[PDB]
């Protein structure tokens, strides 16, 4: 079952990155990516989202994160949170780092993302490895 893999990889990414909040995002419909859901999270939810309304958020494909991901690169920023399911600017988040993951047919299917509320985090080189390992394993799983 796919989210079994998602939640197990996320737990590892969360602990190794020492993030304050982490999530796996999933695009729908397949190959079209008009919407994005949080299908797994670790840590404390940002105040601007609730345990309700974690799914069905529209995807803005002109956002830098979307295009950087399709260039095969990870994305970080201090203020742009494209798929976080709220339009509120959420200044309590100091930092975000994400990588794409691709489904079994190599289609951009979602992201693995870590967030920090504090302003101290480990280097992007270590975050790159943590994220890429999980994307490699999530990329081999299916949807029952």
């Amino acid at each position: 079952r796919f989210e079994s893999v998602a939640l197990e990889q996320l737990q590892i990414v969360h602990i190794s990155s020492e993030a304050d909040f982490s999530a796996v995002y999933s695009f729908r419909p397949k190959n079209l990516n008009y919407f994005v859901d949080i299908i797994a999270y670790e840590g404390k939810l940002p105040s601007t989202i609730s345990e309700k309304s974690l799914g069905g958020y529209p995807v803005d494909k002109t956002m830098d994160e979307y295009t950087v991901h399709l260039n095969g690169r990870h994305y970080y920023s201090n203020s742009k949170f494209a798929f976080l399911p709220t339009k509120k600017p959420t200044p309590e988040i100091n930092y975000m780092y994400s990588c794409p993951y691709f489904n079994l047919d190599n289609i951009y299917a979602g992201t693995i993302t870590m967030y920090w509320y504090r302003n101290d985090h480990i280097s992007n080189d270590r975050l790159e490895s943590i994220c890429a390992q999980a994307a490699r394993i999530l990329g081999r799983a299916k949807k029952l």
Partner: protein, 72 residues
Amino acid sequence: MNVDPHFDKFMESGIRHVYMLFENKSVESSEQFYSFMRTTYKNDPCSSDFECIERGAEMAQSYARIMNIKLE
């Protein structure tokens, strides 16, 4: 395109350096070549454009060799 750009370069390299040389192209031969390329890439995704192009050629060549596929 919504595709893993490293897989795409890897796959396109295999197509243009090897598969296009297949004497007897068919549905089945394209399905078996893609199944091998995808499974191989999913096993160890390449990370550089240059390495993806390199590895897509080599891997497809080895597939053509070991599978005894009529070229020319």
